[PDB]
Every structure is written in C-alpha cells, then in structure tokens.
Amino acid sequence: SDEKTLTVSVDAGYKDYVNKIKGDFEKDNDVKVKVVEKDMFETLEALPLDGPAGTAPDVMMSAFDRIGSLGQQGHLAEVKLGNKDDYDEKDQKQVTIDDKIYGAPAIIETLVLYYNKDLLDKAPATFKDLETLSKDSRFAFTSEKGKNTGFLAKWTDFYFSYGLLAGYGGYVFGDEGTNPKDIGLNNKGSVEGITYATKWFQDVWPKGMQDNKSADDFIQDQFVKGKAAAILGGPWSAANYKEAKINYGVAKIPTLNNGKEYSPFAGGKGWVVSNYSKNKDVAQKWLDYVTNQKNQETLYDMTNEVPANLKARDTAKSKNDELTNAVIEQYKNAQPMPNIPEMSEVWTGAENLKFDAASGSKTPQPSADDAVKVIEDNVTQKYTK
Ligand SMILES: OC[C@H]1O[C@H](O[C@H]2[C@H](O)[C@@H](O)[C@@H](O)O[C@@H]2CO)[C@H](O)[C@@H](O)[C@@H]1O
Ligand SMILES: O=C([O-])C(O)C(=O)[O-]
C-alpha cells in the first residue's frame, strides 16, 4: 500500500539490465522500482527544470566529467560510497569535487589500441613498433607521395592527443586537476608531446589527418576497409568493427619513446541521486546495491562495459575478452579529466594548440604558449578567482 517507490532512469542500453536486477532490490527493501528509459544526457539537461517540478527521476547515471558540475550547481545529492573498499582512490576522485561525493562509480573506460589481426601478427608493443609499421609500404597511401596509414590517431582532437602530452609530463591543471591557475599544456613535457605528434602529421600521415572536422570519418573508413593496421580508439567503436566483420584485436596503447605509458583521460559513468528526490534513503541503498560485486558482474555480463567495482573488474578480466583486458590495463595509466568548471575553457584553446603545430603553421612551443594564453585569459574573464 504505502510501501515506498523509487524511479530509476537509464539510457535504452541499460533498461534490460536494470529490469533484470531490480527484483532482488525490491524484495530486500520493500520498495517498488519504476524503470524509465531516457537518453542519459537529455535526463541531465532537463534535471534543473524537472527537479523543482517534482517530476525528475530519483536516480540516474552520468558521465564522470559532468558529476562534479551537476553537484556544484545543486542538482545532485551528496552520497556515500557503500562499496568504498572495492574502489581505487582514483575512482573515488571521479565522483568527487570540493571534497564532496556526488555519485557512485559504475563503469570505467579509456582509449585503447585497435588492430587488425588479418594485417598484423600481433599488437604493436611500442611507438617504435608503430613508427616501423608506418614505413611498411603495404599500408602506403598512394595518392600522396610517401604517406602511410599503418597507424592512425585523431591527434587534432585534444581528447585523443592529451594522453600523449601527459605521457611526456604534460597536464591540464595542477594539484591533480583542481588548480585552474596552473596550466601544464605548455610545459616542457607537453611541448615534447606536441613535437612528437607533429612528426606524424608532417612526415607520415595523409593530409586528411589534419582536418579535425572529417578526420574521424577518414580514420574509421581506413580501419573498417582494411587499410589501417592499428588505430587509437574508444571502447564505443568496437560494436562497429563487429558489425563490419573485421578480425580486430585490442591492446593497451603502445609504450611511448620515453619508456612511459600513454596517459589518456580516465572516463566512465557513475550512478547519481537527484537532489530534489523525496526518496534519498532508498536512493542511497540503490547506489550501494547497483555498485556491489554481484550487480557489477551482471552489468558486465549484459553490456560488456567494464565495471568500476574492483572485485567485479577482476572477474571481467578473467573472461579474457580483448577489449575488456585492454581497457583494464590502459586504465591503470589514465587520469581523471578535471571536473572543475574551468575545464570548459580548455577545449577551444587546446584545438589551436594541436592544430597550429600539426599544420606546420607554428612551431610546437609558440603553438602551446599562444593557446595557454587564450585559456588563461578566458579563465580569468569568466570565472571567480
Ligand atoms: O570525443 C570526445 C568525447 O569522447 C567520449 O564520448 C564518446 C561517447 O562515450 C560515446 O557514447 C559515443 O557517443 O562517442 C563519443 C565520442 O565520439 C567521451 O565520453 C567524452 O567525454 C568526450 O568528450
Ligand atoms: O526518503 C528520504 O530520505 C526523504 O524523504 C528525502 O529524500 O527527503
């Protein structure tokens, strides 16, 4: 009768999963769970209006990069990590801003190296191996003299190239991504990374790799047609390679020339609670439930998304799936993207940073210095000191 209820909103891809696991939660807590399907981002963009109306769901998911911001803006409730003993400090940091926790980590993801097993005997292990692969004429791009598609990476996109700069010692914001007055994108390390990228753009790759607007289309087209042997990509692309029947393999990103690992952004998703919810106690119980080992293993079983819960992540690793193994291994070297507001100013500035050098229009040092000045000035103008 008056036996409480909880509204759980998820993207279409998680509806079956939530329906499978809700039963045991309902029984364990004397609650009725209502499952609604809605695009993840649309739910979050509507929250500021649905919340005061009393029409927003009680719990939903969010990419890690938005949790801090939604928490600061007052749209998400502070929550506890019931499964803290099963989370690395890095994953706790993903859902934390200003020493306040606004979600429970659920899924991890990062960039990996996809390769074609019909073209290569094994995954390249280092960037030195990729450099030699780029001189194998079986991958020559004949319409442009001396260009090669052996290895491709969308380095005009800062989301992709960040891990290269970071592998050399670059960083976005100092104090582990929390100090917007300390920008590391023009430090010695970042410039070494930019310089290395520029060699690929200028000496190896087809001209099309410099056009950020169409580079992803070019890269996917080459890999899916068996013309690129290895490429940098996210887990989200695997489904497409499966659809196209490519005998693809997946590996950690090869080791950089300095002996350090590529250090991409550590992405993923967490479960969050509406700050407007009238069912926060039950919502807290839901977060602790859905992020426990059993339910995290079911998540992986149903969706192939890598669990945040470490006990569940080990179980996923034991399945010996290449994409899962690559993501788990590479995630060890991934750092969280800053979740502070000032991160919004990094994107436009970082475009120029990579492009001006990639195109040979500026040398790497002024390309980086000029872009950092753009970012710094925007931070000063738009945000409180
Ligand atoms: O490219 C920048 C963007 O990459 C990732 O977003 C993915 C997303 O996870 C997928 O669902 C699909 O839509 O492809 C997107 C990229 O093409 C990151 O999650 C995101 O933070 C980042 O800005
Ligand atoms: O259930 C609760 O925790 C309470 O009703 C609230 O969310 O305000």
Short mmCIF file of all heavy atoms in Angstrom, two decimals, residues 49-85:
data_model
loop_
_atom_site.label_atom_id
_atom_site.label_comp_id
_atom_site.label_asym_id
_atom_site.label_seq_id
_atom_site.Cartn_x
_atom_site.Cartn_y
_atom_site.Cartn_z
N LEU A 49 14.94 21.73 -14.48
CA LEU A 49 13.51 22.08 -14.61
C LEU A 49 12.60 20.98 -14.04
O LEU A 49 11.60 21.27 -13.38
CB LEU A 49 13.16 22.37 -16.07
CG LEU A 49 13.91 23.55 -16.72
CD1 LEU A 49 13.65 23.61 -18.22
CD2 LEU A 49 13.56 24.89 -16.09
N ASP A 50 12.94 19.71 -14.28
CA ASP A 50 12.12 18.60 -13.73
C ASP A 50 12.20 18.51 -12.20
O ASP A 50 11.21 18.15 -11.53
CB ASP A 50 12.60 17.26 -14.29
CG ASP A 50 12.38 17.13 -15.77
OD1 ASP A 50 11.59 17.89 -16.35
OD2 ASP A 50 12.99 16.23 -16.36
N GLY A 51 13.37 18.83 -11.66
CA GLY A 51 13.62 18.76 -10.22
C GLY A 51 12.66 19.57 -9.37
O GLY A 51 11.98 19.02 -8.50
N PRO A 52 12.61 20.90 -9.58
CA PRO A 52 11.66 21.73 -8.83
C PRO A 52 10.18 21.36 -9.12
O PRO A 52 9.31 21.56 -8.25
CB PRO A 52 11.98 23.15 -9.31
CG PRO A 52 13.42 23.08 -9.73
CD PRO A 52 13.58 21.72 -10.35
N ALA A 53 9.91 20.83 -10.31
CA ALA A 53 8.56 20.43 -10.67
C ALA A 53 8.11 19.16 -9.93
O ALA A 53 6.92 18.84 -9.89
CB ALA A 53 8.48 20.21 -12.18
N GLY A 54 9.07 18.45 -9.32
CA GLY A 54 8.81 17.19 -8.64
C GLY A 54 8.64 16.05 -9.63
O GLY A 54 8.11 15.01 -9.26
N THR A 55 9.08 16.24 -10.88
CA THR A 55 8.94 15.23 -11.95
C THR A 55 10.23 14.51 -12.35
O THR A 55 10.20 13.66 -13.25
CB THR A 55 8.39 15.88 -13.23
OG1 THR A 55 9.39 16.75 -13.81
CG2 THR A 55 7.09 16.66 -12.95
N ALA A 56 11.37 14.84 -11.73
CA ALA A 56 12.63 14.21 -12.10
C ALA A 56 12.74 12.82 -11.48
O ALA A 56 12.20 12.60 -10.39
CB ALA A 56 13.80 15.05 -11.63
N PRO A 57 13.48 11.91 -12.13
CA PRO A 57 13.70 10.59 -11.54
C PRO A 57 14.53 10.72 -10.25
O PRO A 57 15.18 11.75 -10.03
CB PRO A 57 14.52 9.86 -12.62
CG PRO A 57 15.23 10.95 -13.33
CD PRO A 57 14.24 12.06 -13.39
N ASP A 58 14.48 9.70 -9.40
CA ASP A 58 15.26 9.70 -8.17
C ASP A 58 16.72 9.40 -8.40
O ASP A 58 17.59 10.01 -7.75
CB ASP A 58 14.72 8.66 -7.20
CG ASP A 58 13.32 8.97 -6.77
OD1 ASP A 58 13.12 10.04 -6.16
OD2 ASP A 58 12.43 8.12 -7.01
N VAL A 59 17.01 8.44 -9.28
CA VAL A 59 18.38 8.07 -9.60
C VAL A 59 18.56 7.93 -11.10
O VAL A 59 17.61 7.61 -11.83
CB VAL A 59 18.83 6.77 -8.91
CG1 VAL A 59 18.87 6.93 -7.39
CG2 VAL A 59 17.93 5.62 -9.31
N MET A 60 19.77 8.20 -11.56
CA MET A 60 20.11 8.13 -12.97
C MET A 60 21.63 7.97 -13.09
O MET A 60 22.31 7.86 -12.08
CB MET A 60 19.60 9.39 -13.67
CG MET A 60 20.30 10.67 -13.25
SD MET A 60 19.18 12.08 -12.99
CE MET A 60 18.64 11.61 -11.35
N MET A 61 22.15 7.95 -14.30
CA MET A 61 23.57 7.85 -14.50
C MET A 61 24.10 9.13 -15.11
O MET A 61 23.34 9.95 -15.65
CB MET A 61 23.89 6.65 -15.40
CG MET A 61 23.44 5.31 -14.82
SD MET A 61 23.63 3.95 -16.00
CE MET A 61 25.37 4.03 -16.31
N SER A 62 25.42 9.31 -15.02
CA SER A 62 26.09 10.44 -15.62
C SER A 62 27.53 10.09 -15.94
O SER A 62 28.16 9.32 -15.21
CB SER A 62 26.07 11.65 -14.68
OG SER A 62 26.83 12.73 -15.21
N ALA A 63 28.03 10.63 -17.05
CA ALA A 63 29.44 10.52 -17.36
C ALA A 63 30.18 11.17 -16.20
O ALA A 63 29.68 12.14 -15.61
CB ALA A 63 29.77 11.25 -18.64
N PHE A 64 31.37 10.66 -15.88
CA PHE A 64 32.18 11.21 -14.79
C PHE A 64 32.46 12.71 -14.97
O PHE A 64 32.43 13.47 -14.00
CB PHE A 64 33.55 10.52 -14.66
CG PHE A 64 33.50 9.10 -14.15
CD1 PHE A 64 34.45 8.18 -14.57
CD2 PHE A 64 32.60 8.70 -13.16
CE1 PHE A 64 34.46 6.89 -14.09
CE2 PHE A 64 32.60 7.40 -12.68
CZ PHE A 64 33.53 6.51 -13.13
N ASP A 65 32.69 13.13 -16.21
CA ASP A 65 33.06 14.53 -16.46
C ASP A 65 32.02 15.61 -16.09
O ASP A 65 32.39 16.80 -15.98
CB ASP A 65 33.58 14.73 -17.90
CG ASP A 65 32.54 14.39 -18.98
OD1 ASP A 65 31.32 14.37 -18.72
OD2 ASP A 65 32.98 14.16 -20.13
N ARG A 66 30.77 15.21 -15.92
CA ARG A 66 29.65 16.09 -15.55
C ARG A 66 29.20 16.01 -14.08
O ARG A 66 28.44 16.85 -13.64
CB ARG A 66 28.43 15.73 -16.42
CG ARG A 66 28.54 16.17 -17.86
CD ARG A 66 27.99 17.59 -17.98
NE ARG A 66 26.51 17.57 -17.98
CZ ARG A 66 25.73 18.63 -17.75
NH1 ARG A 66 26.25 19.82 -17.47
NH2 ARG A 66 24.40 18.49 -17.81
N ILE A 67 29.64 15.00 -13.35
CA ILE A 67 29.15 14.79 -11.97
C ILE A 67 29.49 15.94 -11.03
O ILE A 67 28.62 16.44 -10.32
CB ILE A 67 29.60 13.44 -11.40
CG1 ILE A 67 28.92 12.32 -12.18
CG2 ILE A 67 29.26 13.33 -9.91
CD1 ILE A 67 29.33 10.90 -11.82
N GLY A 68 30.74 16.38 -11.06
CA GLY A 68 31.18 17.50 -10.24
C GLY A 68 30.37 18.75 -10.51
O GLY A 68 29.86 19.40 -9.58
N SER A 69 30.21 19.07 -11.78
CA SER A 69 29.44 20.26 -12.16
C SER A 69 27.97 20.20 -11.73
O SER A 69 27.41 21.21 -11.27
CB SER A 69 29.50 20.47 -13.67
OG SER A 69 28.62 21.50 -14.03
N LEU A 70 27.33 19.05 -11.89
CA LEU A 70 25.93 18.92 -11.51
C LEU A 70 25.81 19.00 -9.99
O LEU A 70 24.81 19.50 -9.46
CB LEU A 70 25.32 17.63 -12.06
CG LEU A 70 25.19 17.60 -13.59
CD1 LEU A 70 24.98 16.20 -14.11
CD2 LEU A 70 24.09 18.53 -14.05
N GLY A 71 26.82 18.50 -9.30
CA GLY A 71 26.82 18.57 -7.83
C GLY A 71 26.98 20.00 -7.34
O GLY A 71 26.26 20.43 -6.45
N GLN A 72 27.94 20.72 -7.92
CA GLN A 72 28.16 22.13 -7.55
C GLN A 72 26.95 23.01 -7.80
O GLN A 72 26.64 23.90 -7.00
CB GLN A 72 29.34 22.72 -8.33
CG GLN A 72 30.69 22.26 -7.87
CD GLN A 72 31.82 22.98 -8.62
OE1 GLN A 72 31.77 23.15 -9.86
NE2 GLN A 72 32.84 23.37 -7.89
N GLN A 73 26.26 22.75 -8.90
CA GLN A 73 25.07 23.50 -9.28
C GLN A 73 23.84 23.19 -8.43
O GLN A 73 22.82 23.81 -8.61
CB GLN A 73 24.73 23.26 -10.75
CG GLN A 73 25.73 23.85 -11.73
CD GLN A 73 25.44 23.43 -13.16
OE1 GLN A 73 24.51 22.66 -13.41
NE2 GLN A 73 26.24 23.92 -14.09
N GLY A 74 23.95 22.21 -7.53
CA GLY A 74 22.85 21.87 -6.63
C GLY A 74 21.83 20.87 -7.15
O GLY A 74 20.79 20.66 -6.51
N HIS A 75 22.12 20.21 -8.28
CA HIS A 75 21.16 19.26 -8.87
C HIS A 75 21.30 17.81 -8.38
O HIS A 75 20.37 17.01 -8.53
CB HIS A 75 21.26 19.31 -10.40
CG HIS A 75 21.11 20.69 -10.97
ND1 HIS A 75 20.01 21.48 -10.73
CD2 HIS A 75 21.91 21.40 -11.79
CE1 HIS A 75 20.15 22.63 -11.36
NE2 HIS A 75 21.29 22.60 -12.02
N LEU A 76 22.46 17.45 -7.84
CA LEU A 76 22.70 16.09 -7.32
C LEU A 76 22.89 16.10 -5.81
O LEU A 76 23.50 17.01 -5.27
CB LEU A 76 23.94 15.47 -7.96
CG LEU A 76 23.93 15.40 -9.48
CD1 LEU A 76 25.23 14.80 -9.98
CD2 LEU A 76 22.74 14.59 -9.97
N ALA A 77 22.41 15.06 -5.15
CA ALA A 77 22.59 14.91 -3.71
C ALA A 77 23.99 14.39 -3.39
O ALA A 77 24.55 13.63 -4.16
CB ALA A 77 21.57 13.91 -3.18
N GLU A 78 24.54 14.78 -2.24
CA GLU A 78 25.78 14.17 -1.76
C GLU A 78 25.42 12.75 -1.35
O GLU A 78 24.37 12.54 -0.75
CB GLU A 78 26.36 14.90 -0.55
CG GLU A 78 26.82 16.30 -0.85
CD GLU A 78 27.39 16.99 0.38
OE1 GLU A 78 28.17 16.36 1.13
OE2 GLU A 78 27.05 18.17 0.58
N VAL A 79 26.27 11.79 -1.70
CA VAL A 79 26.02 10.37 -1.42
C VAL A 79 27.24 9.72 -0.81
O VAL A 79 28.36 10.28 -0.86
CB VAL A 79 25.63 9.59 -2.69
CG1 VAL A 79 24.28 10.07 -3.21
CG2 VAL A 79 26.71 9.74 -3.78
N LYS A 80 27.03 8.54 -0.24
CA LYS A 80 28.11 7.78 0.37
C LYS A 80 28.47 6.63 -0.55
O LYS A 80 27.64 6.18 -1.35
CB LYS A 80 27.71 7.22 1.73
CG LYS A 80 27.25 8.27 2.74
CD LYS A 80 26.93 7.62 4.07
CE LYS A 80 26.36 8.61 5.08
NZ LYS A 80 27.31 9.73 5.35
N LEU A 81 29.72 6.17 -0.45
CA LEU A 81 30.20 5.04 -1.22
C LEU A 81 30.19 3.79 -0.35
O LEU A 81 31.17 3.47 0.34
CB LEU A 81 31.60 5.29 -1.75
CG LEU A 81 31.75 6.52 -2.64
CD1 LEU A 81 33.20 6.65 -3.08
CD2 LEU A 81 30.82 6.45 -3.83
N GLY A 82 29.06 3.07 -0.37
CA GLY A 82 28.92 1.85 0.41
C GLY A 82 29.95 0.80 0.05
O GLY A 82 30.37 0.00 0.90
N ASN A 83 30.36 0.81 -1.21
CA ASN A 83 31.36 -0.13 -1.72
C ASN A 83 32.74 0.49 -1.84
O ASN A 83 33.51 0.10 -2.70
CB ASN A 83 30.90 -0.67 -3.06
CG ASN A 83 29.59 -1.39 -2.93
OD1 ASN A 83 29.50 -2.33 -2.15
ND2 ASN A 83 28.57 -0.94 -3.65
N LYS A 84 33.04 1.43 -0.95
CA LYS A 84 34.34 2.13 -0.95
C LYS A 84 35.54 1.16 -0.90
O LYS A 84 36.55 1.39 -1.56
CB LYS A 84 34.41 3.09 0.25
CG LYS A 84 35.60 4.05 0.23
CD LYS A 84 35.72 4.83 1.53
CE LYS A 84 36.95 5.72 1.52
NZ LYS A 84 37.27 6.25 2.87
N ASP A 85 35.41 0.08 -0.12
CA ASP A 85 36.51 -0.90 0.00
C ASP A 85 36.83 -1.57 -1.33
O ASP A 85 37.88 -2.18 -1.46
CB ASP A 85 36.18 -1.98 1.05
CG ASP A 85 36.22 -1.45 2.46
OD1 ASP A 85 36.78 -0.36 2.68
OD2 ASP A 85 35.71 -2.15 3.37
#
